[PDB]
Each structure stands twice: as structure tokens, then as C-alpha cells.
Design an enzyme around this catalytic site. Sequence first.
Site, PDB file in Angstrom:
ATOM      1  N   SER A  75      45.604  39.115  36.482  1.00 18.55           N
ATOM      2  CA  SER A  75      45.173  38.018  35.255  1.00 18.55           C
ATOM      3  C   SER A  75      46.551  37.735  34.514  1.00 18.55           C
ATOM      4  O   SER A  75      47.154  38.832  34.234  1.00 18.55           O
ATOM      5  CB  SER A  75      44.113  38.625  34.540  1.00 18.55           C
ATOM      6  OG  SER A  75      43.690  37.723  33.224  1.00 18.55           O
TER       7      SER A  75
ATOM      8  N   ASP B  73      27.835  43.261  46.782  1.00 16.85           N
ATOM      9  CA  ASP B  73      28.807  43.827  46.197  1.00 16.85           C
ATOM     10  C   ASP B  73      30.142  43.765  46.691  1.00 16.85           C
ATOM     11  O   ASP B  73      30.551  44.139  47.805  1.00 16.85           O
ATOM     12  CB  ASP B  73      28.299  45.419  46.261  1.00 16.85           C
ATOM     13  CG  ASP B  73      29.548  46.407  45.631  1.00 16.85           C
ATOM     14  OD1 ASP B  73      30.399  45.643  44.602  1.00 16.85           O
ATOM     15  OD2 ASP B  73      29.325  47.605  45.574  1.00 16.85           O
TER      16      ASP B  73
END
Length: 330
Positions: free
Chosen positions: A199, A35
Site C-alpha cells: 500500500s 479465503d
Amino acid sequence: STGSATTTPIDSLDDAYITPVQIGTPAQTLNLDFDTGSSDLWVFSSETTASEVDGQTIYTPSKSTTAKLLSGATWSISYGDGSSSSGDVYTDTVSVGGLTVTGQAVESAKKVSSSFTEDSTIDGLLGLAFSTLNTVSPTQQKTFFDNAKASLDSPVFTADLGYHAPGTYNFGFIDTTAYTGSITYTAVSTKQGFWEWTSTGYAVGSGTFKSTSIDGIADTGTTLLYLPATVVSAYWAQVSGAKSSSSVGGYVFPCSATLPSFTFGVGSARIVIPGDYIDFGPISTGSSSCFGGIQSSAGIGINIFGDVALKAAFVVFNGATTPTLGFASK
């Protein structure tokens, strides 16, 4: 030195990926969920309540010659999905694909929540986020990547997740055969303790790229892609019969529909998620409504670039002094 371990989807939908990890001497192999959205190495151990265990492999520190109880240390963690776990902390030798760390904090779970109990294939988690998120008190502990970093050829680890197929986690080296073209690196903010990046935009199917900033986290511990409501609605508006079901708890689509792709920008580069990656199958066995792979982050408060987005790319997690994320096509 380096490490190379194979990661495998737990089921036919890629709900999670387990990676074999050796703990103790003689080694005990547990299947951990790597994770990058948490920083704890916790396992189901012999100290767990026998009711909260359902077919999982257990770490038995009493059967380990290199196990030391980290006296007084405790951990308490709550995840984004509402799941949780707590217990005491041990130290032991932990290896991932040959890469060994001696004196690694292995958090023995005394108590686990129902979501963990149901997942028999997952024996615990391996936190690969920044060690500032580690929940061990009173002495905060470092992650396996942090403890290995000094002895790694390069201070990086890469994620190469597969679509309905196994993939890889490499530590200390970049496999130039695992990707095509260049790896585009992007700045990481270590403020919230996650691999936080921005992004540069998005596209829905063959639509024109929308240049817009979308801050998110590269998170391997989250299955789906969680973007802002504006971005997700634009995507599901291109799927016939798709709607946001409140009873399901998210976007659903007719299983008969063919999903368009989703492109997300990484600097001046693009990563294309095939429409197939966004199909999570029927909401319930035999149903005609299918679960979407792109969901809204409205409730989370953070945008999450999970396995749906990451398995479409070769992802480099650079833990150098100035940490960066790299995305390449494959």
C-alpha cells in the site's frame, strides 16, 4: 468459461461471508467461506466427530458417484486466529457459480476446532491463495482457482464484498458494471504464498495523505483490517473515548461516537473506507463499548487488508504468470 457466485454476510456485523458451492454428483451445496488467505478446500464431512458438528451441512462422499478417496493424503491446517482442522482428502467435481472443476481435492474434516463448531452457517473454506500454501501431504494439491485457471476466459477472479449486504465472486471475467473509474493494478509477491502487496500510504478522515509503504496481504478470510501500531494509533487518536483494551483484546470505542473514514493508497490511487465499515457494534450485548474495525498487526507479524478494507473496493485477483492485484472504487 466463467463462474459467478453470490457471497453473503453470515451475520449483522459481516463477521464472515459464505458462498454456495456444489460438490459431487448429484451435487451437494455447502456454504463455504472464500479465503484468499489460505489454499485449502476443506469441508465438514460425514467423517467429522459428531461432537464437533453444530447444525452445519455435511459433505457425504459415499453419496457421490464422482468421489474418489485420494489414498494416503492428509491435511493439517492452523489459522491466524488460532483455529485448526485435519482429516483425509477426497477428489470430486466442484462448481462455483457454474464454473466446474473435475478432480478437485475436497479435504474431508475428521477433526475441527471450537471456532468452526460455533459457526453453524460456515460449512468449510475455499482457499484462493497460492497453491504453495496447500497443507495436503505427501502430494501438495492445487486450489480451485488454479484448477480452473486454464479453462477460464481470463486467469482472474474478482471479489466484490458488500457492507451489510450480499456481494459477488466472479471467476474468469471482470464485470465493468461492478465498479467506477479505473482498476489500479499493483505488484504481488508470491514468496509467502499470499496475495502480498504494498500500500502506498494512508489518511485518517479528512486528514492529509501520509505517503508511506505498508506491505500487506489482500485477505478475504480475515474480517478486520490489521495495520502497524503507528498507523492504527493515529486512526484511533481521532476517535473520542477510544482506547486499546487488553481485556477485550484490541481497540474499543464509545458506541455513541461517529468514526472517521480511513483511506489507503493503491499506487497513485486511494480507496476510502467509510467510518461505518469500521464499526463492529457492542463488545457484548447491551455494552456501551464498541469493537473497532481497525486493529494492530503487532502480534500477527503480517499486515492484513481484510473484509473491512476489501468491501470498500472492487478487487481483482489476477493469477496471470506475473500475478497482480487490482483495486477500484464502487
